[PDB]
Amino acid sequence: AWKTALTTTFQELRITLSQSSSSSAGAREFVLGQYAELKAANPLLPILVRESNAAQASLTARYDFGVEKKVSIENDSASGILSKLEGLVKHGQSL
Amino acid sequence: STLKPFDLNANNAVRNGPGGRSSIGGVVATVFGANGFIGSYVVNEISKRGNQVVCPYRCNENKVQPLKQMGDLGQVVLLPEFDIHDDEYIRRAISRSNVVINCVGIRQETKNYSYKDVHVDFPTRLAKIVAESGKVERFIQVSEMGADVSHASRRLQTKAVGDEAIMKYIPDATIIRPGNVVGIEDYFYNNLIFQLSYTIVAPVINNGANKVQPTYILDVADAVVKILKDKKTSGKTYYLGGPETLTMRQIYDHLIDTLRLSNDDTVNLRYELAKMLYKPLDTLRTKLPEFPFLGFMMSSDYAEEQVADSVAPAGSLGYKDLSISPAKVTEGLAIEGVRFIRVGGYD
Amino acid sequence: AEKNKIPETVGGAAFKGDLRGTSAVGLGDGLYSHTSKWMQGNGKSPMDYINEVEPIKVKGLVVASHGSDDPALGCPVEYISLKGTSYENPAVCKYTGNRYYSDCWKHG
Amino acid sequence: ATAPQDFSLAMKKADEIYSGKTVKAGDIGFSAGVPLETYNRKVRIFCPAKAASQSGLGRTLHPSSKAPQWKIVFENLSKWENPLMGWTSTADPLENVGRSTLLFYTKEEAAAFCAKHGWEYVVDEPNPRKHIRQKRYLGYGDNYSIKRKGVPDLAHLPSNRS
Amino acid sequence: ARTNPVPAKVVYLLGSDDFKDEEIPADAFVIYQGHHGDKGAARANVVLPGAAYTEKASLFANTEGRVQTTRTAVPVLGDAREDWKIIRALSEVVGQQLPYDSQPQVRARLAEVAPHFAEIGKAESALWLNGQYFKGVKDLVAKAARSTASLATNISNYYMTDAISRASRTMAKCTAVRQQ
């Protein structure tokens, strides 16, 4: 449903996370479980997963004309990550 | 403040450095009349910013001594033998130059050179020689404010005719038209002081009614730099008058005040009398060499130019277009030179 | 042409087809020869002088080169191999530029 | 690494006996009296690496080295050529001061100096040098080991051939 | 861009002298930003001079991804500028001003886009996500066809591979020596 609509809404999606951290455990679960499904729904959409040891987990969406919205995903379960991405899609609809 | 480039083609390549003496500016200049009062300051401004100035001068090593200090090694080039009638020398002088400034002028006539030669023939000949080259990008000619074709004085009339000839040959030339320039080596305040102090009586043409707009030498020198830093100025005549318009009587009175002269030594030598006293003495001048005793003041041309108002026309370009605020010539640093003479606590 | 040519060595003290060690002096002015960079005239260059001097025959497979005749008034003592040297292809003293050749290696 | 056992002994001892009073960062720079735009320049605190031409370890941070090896260097600025003589001209007052004279034993010393004057600094640690030979040529004996071509096959022996 | 190819009307070359000729529609307005004059500069309506790796303090990522930085060994030549400053000045001119106005701010933007760029000199490990990616691109990998080409290097001549090497006289001599 809404997973199909990321391409239409987002120009790119960035998932920043820490390689080994307690705060980024939920982000790691999200990326190692739902990234394949999100890519399957949106093949041509660039979903960039970038990681560093001291990196702070976040979910950033770039809309048309360079408008970027960053959502912190720290200490949030994988389901909450999915909800936050849905909220990002709704915000993109508002634009 | 941000340094503005000299708007010359391919300057961006050659220019390098902070803009000081040792920096490289992409301006090679042939300033005719460099050893003069106006020319020396223009040479100083151009050379101060790291540019190279070629200074053609009539053989006189002591007169061109200050120009030696003006620039770093190899920047101020002094060419020894300058003649206004020699084409080949003029071509050699402007060979490497991309800007040419003409400050060559005579206040009075002599036997060797008349007004028509210096103020008309030389500008036309130099204009043709500059036009044939093509490397020269900017041309600046310095003239009086009161110069007009319909002027009684021969000097101010010949100057305007020469300016028109320059405009004909080079359409993109800029005609700088400053007023009576005040400076340490000026011929305005210095001659007025010498008149007040070492002359039996100070003759004033009419009652000093004639209005003038004197300007400080540094302002004109900066105005030259602002002309060269903008290409949009090309083809336009700028009347660089001073901040304040003053009658000649006010300037005489204020000189008497600053010097603290005992009383007023000025007399009323009204017009129609100077036109009879100096009229033969002009013919005397044209047949005799340069003599210090009589000059400039003691001529019919000076009386004719002191019966008119040498003020800027209302619609005209000036210092405001160049974003310069002229300094007052009756107060401040401009007047220090006359101040050193006497201020009433002095001697 | 010289603007796109590879700097090369004639080969008197070097080989015919080697690169020439070059700095960037004169690159803006447009000079690409060693002598042009420092001499602006049309006179005879010191390289022209050294070329005019002819190779000298010596006996043995090594020659001691002091540059000048007196050892302490010239270049440091140098020992140059004369093996595989002939008049057309002489050995060279690096300090002085003198050329030497010997026939001893050919068992003569 | 043992000890210099020379004037450096008294040098270090003068260091440990005495100390400097703490001041707020940048306050000394005003006392210095130099133009304040000097401290707008950025600082790199680094130790030079070894030149590839030479095999000496003196210039490196090595236990052999007993000299200050950490430099404060300023960023490179514009340089041009003299129009008359082609000399290299500059307007940078701090061109050679840091390389020539600002030498420190330890990175914290240079950082303290920079913070005291108010210079912003970035410290770059040298790439670690470990003197570990590879397993193939760990020793001189390894040069002539059976590793080169394997143990000699004895199928060429006349008894084995026949 | 991939879904609906659009003939480019303005092409910006950021040091690209190795572009395929079909990349520019031959009626496009080409802006070349770079430090050597080569195939890119010849086909440019506007050429913007930029500094080289020896003249700028810039970030590069290795094949292992370790972020390393250059220093300004020699000053910039003529009226050339640092490339990011050129792009930001152009952004102000065109009416879309970019937030950064200093090199550390640019580095902070790089840290935001990719956190490892903050860790200069250190290689950051990568989570093994390659299998999930190929599970994601199932239809596309099926879409990809077979080509009559054999796996081989694209480097014809090693000494000349970029604009700097092509300008080098020494590399040309090395290439001539190999080709004789």
Add this chain to the structure above:
Amino acid sequence: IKTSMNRCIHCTRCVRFTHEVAGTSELGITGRGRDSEVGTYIEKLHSSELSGNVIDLCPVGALLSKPYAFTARSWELKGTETIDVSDALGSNIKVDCRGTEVMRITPRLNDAINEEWLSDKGRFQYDGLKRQRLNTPLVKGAKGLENATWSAAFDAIRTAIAGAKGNELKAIAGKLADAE
């Protein structure tokens, strides 16, 4: 490679490098006793792209750099530690400069990436940094590309971008473009 074998102390660093590391196995000590000599017995040219490293490995200047020949002395050069953009290895290098000119490039120690070795392209491509350089902004006219100021070039780029819209604007990055 320039040769002065008279200066050669008979270490075996060049032979050991050519055999173990470079692997072309071209150099050896031919002879016995004092007349023992180092080099190819035949007239051969060193073929490895790691050939420059023997010059650094040579302790006594018998092997020297022909491009960097008689041009400068060591004390005259200011060294700045930077990285090589020749390839994606990011070899750590030290660029030695006199004034505004880069005089030579030599490797630095980084066991992580380049142990202490540098490829010939990276070592000797500084020559092409003095040639075919772009110094000033150029804007095309009927007379070709011509000198322009930064403002005029930006104005032309603005007039060009105004026409294009969306994917009509296209960017191609080069081999040597940096992250910023």
Add this chain to the structure above:
Amino acid sequence: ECYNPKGSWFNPAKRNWKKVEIWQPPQV
């Protein structure tokens, strides 16, 4: 007026001691 540096105005072929060759744009 016999000896002057090569960068002098008097020198027949005046020298700008630039150490970099500049790209010349193609004609037309």
